Amino acid sequence: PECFTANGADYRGTQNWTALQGGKPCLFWNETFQHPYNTLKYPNGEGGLGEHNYCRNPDGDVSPWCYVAEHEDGVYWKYCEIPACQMPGNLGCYKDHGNPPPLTGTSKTSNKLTIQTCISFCRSQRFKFAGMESGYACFCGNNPDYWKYGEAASTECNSVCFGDHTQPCGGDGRIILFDTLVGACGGNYSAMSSVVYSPDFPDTYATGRVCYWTIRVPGASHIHFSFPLFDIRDSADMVELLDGYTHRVLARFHGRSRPPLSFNVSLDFVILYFFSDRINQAQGFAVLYQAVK
Amino acid sequence: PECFTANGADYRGTQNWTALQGGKPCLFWNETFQHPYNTLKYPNGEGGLGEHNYCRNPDGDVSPWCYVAEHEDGVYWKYCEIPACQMPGNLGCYKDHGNPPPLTGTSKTSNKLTIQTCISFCRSQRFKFAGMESGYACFCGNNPDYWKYGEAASTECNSVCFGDHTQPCGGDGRIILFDTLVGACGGNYSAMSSVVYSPDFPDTYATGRVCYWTIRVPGASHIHFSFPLFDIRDSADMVELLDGYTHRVLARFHGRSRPPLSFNVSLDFVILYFFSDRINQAQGFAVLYQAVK
Ligand SMILES: *[C@@H]1O[C@H](CO)[C@@H](O)[C@H](O)[C@H]1NC(C)=O
Ligand SMILES: *[C@@H]1O[C@H](CO)[C@@H](O)[C@H](O)[C@H]1NC(C)=O
Ligand SMILES: *[C@@H]1O[C@H](CO)[C@@H](O)[C@H](O)[C@H]1NC(C)=O
Ligand SMILES: *[C@@H]1O[C@H](CO)[C@@H](O)[C@H](O)[C@H]1NC(C)=O
Ligand SMILES: *[C@@H]1O[C@H](CO)[C@@H](O)[C@H](O)[C@H]1NC(C)=O
Ligand SMILES: *[C@@H]1O[C@H](CO)[C@@H](O)[C@H](O)[C@H]1NC(C)=O
Ligand SMILES: [Ca+2]
Numbered sequence A, B: 001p002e003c004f005t006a007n008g009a010d011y012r013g014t015q016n017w018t019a020l021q022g023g024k025p026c027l028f029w030n031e032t033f034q035h036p037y038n039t040l041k042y043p044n045g046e047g048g049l050g051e052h053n054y055c056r057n058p059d060g061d062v063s064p065w066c067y068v069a070e071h072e073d074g075v076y077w078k079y080c081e082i083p084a085c086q087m088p089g090n091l092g093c094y095k096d097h098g099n100p101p102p103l104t105g106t107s108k109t110s111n112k113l114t115i116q117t118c119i120s121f122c123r124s125q126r127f128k129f130a131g132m133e134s135g136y137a138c139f140c141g142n143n144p145d146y147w148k149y150g151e152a153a154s155t156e157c158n159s160v161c162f163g164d165h166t167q168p169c170g171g172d173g174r175i176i177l178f179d180t181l182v183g184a185c186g187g188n189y190s191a192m193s194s195v196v197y198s199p200d201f202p203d204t205y206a207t208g209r210v211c212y213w214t215i216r217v218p219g220a221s222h223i224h225f226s227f228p229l230f231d232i233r234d235s236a237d238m239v240e241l242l243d244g245y246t247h248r249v250l251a252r253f254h255g256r257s258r259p260p261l262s263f264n265v266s267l268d269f270v271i272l273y274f275f276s277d278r279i280n281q282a283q284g285f286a287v288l289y290q291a292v293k
């Protein structure tokens, strides 16, 4: 996967066509001077813009996109449908033909819906799946067949969440699906490999959080950790790895000391901690662990 | 002050009489071998016991005490009434003759009363004073005249709190009083000098706390900090000082790196942070700051 955010704001792959099948080619960001977004607006490379025509998401839209025309008379930019840009725990964009819905546990509507407010709702009620539709509608369930009506292109799930216009909240007859583990404040992991996100992900992390996750893989000689996303604002915001047996703090990362791409810990049992101050919020993190025997 | 706990478990002064007026002399802990508490039980000096007859509180009682007889036939130990052993924010032990009570805001009873559960109740309702009586009764108020019926000896407020037998919860017609700032999860200080305690103090700090307190004294060239009490259990429990203007972390202290007796920060504006993991609890801290012009 090349995205660990819900809107692919961290995408830096090389897709330069709005779609791999029947797509249009992107314009180069170092040529897009009619347009708001270009390399003269963002020197320093902000948003991943540069001397390329790769799909990017610099303006906090719901998904990577690119310019497809030089003059903005008609349709001049388009979302990119990038297969590898699907955060782990986003199960995809699915069709919802009405009766029954794809998720049959419970549901609500909110004028402030976000991805997490929906996830959080579902999780609280002990459902494994949460699905956003039409920007404002949250459905929850344990039905395995949330795909009952079929997959859709990710771009048909790009209505803005009514409570956060940086996030995708499905569409008309379209439901974007998430594992309710996503953004949980704690959890226990024993898969060989998985991803753990900050609390409230993909919303920004709330203030005053203390959260931990156990990672425990019987047999493992080591666990390799990488931080494909690390957007932690404050010095007093912290991500910590503990030895699971001894509780010793193996590494501390904060807003002024970032993690390596990656590192190894030779334990089979680790505790990830996150602490959030009451000052500034940010997108948070995604940690990917792969255990090795 | 020589105590920064509610039960004087941190008292290490030299009072060796149950009271300074009309008192009895304490027995030496290196002679008290009939008794449970003595230097052979606690080598390593645990509880402040040693080759002395000073009042101490090693057994998590409600107040310092000492042995007054060698054979435990009748009355063989007694609480010490130590004037300097009164934590800041404990306003003292007062008489309550019934009608009206000394605090007239509101009140409750609880089979689990602690000092903090009472304080917390009162604070929540916006009262400045909280008063425990008879072990189970909490009164709150803003009345300045909580001393209306007079002061009592601190030892007449030594009924165990029904919810924590290490703590004093007043007596029959006796009310022990506390400022509701004590153990608050945050607050703003501008006094020249004051004390700030961990959250939930004098109860042990709860899990998952993130708390900050501002200390801000217009004019100050520096603030001297000292840590007369620091009982923080875990490496992942933390106390941090921030520069108030820049939010830079000036010092981090945790369960495996304790603060100096004392140190100076040359700012007039500092933020104290506390972070509690979800593993082990302990008594917490008391920080005393004195600002200097
Ligand atoms: C897409 O990008 C690659 C460089 O990574 C380049 O070879 C190719 O010409 C680009 N395609 C278009 C249609 O601009
Ligand atoms: C933009 O940069 C690309 C890659 O260096 C280059 O091929 C293209 O001609 C440039 N266009 C402009 C207007 O600078
Ligand atoms: C971590 O372990 C892997 C095998 O899982 C090894 O190939 C790699 O070199 C190690 N990484 C580091 C940064 O030491
Ligand atoms: C009290 O302690 C002091 C030593 O600090 C000693 O001089 C004195 O004799 C003690 N008093 C009694 C009555 O044991
Ligand atoms: C206990 O220690 C004190 C101070 O050293 C000493 O005066 C006293 O005689 C000792 N008593 C015993 C039984 O050791
Ligand atoms: C801190 O400041 C005081 C004056 O408030 C000074 O006398 C003292 O030596 C300083 N303490 C330290 C540890 O530097
Ligand atoms: Ca923060």
Ligand SMILES: [Ca+2]
Residues within 6 Å of the ligand: B233, B234, B236, B237, B276, B277, B278, B279, B280, B281, B282
């Ligand atoms: Ca702890």
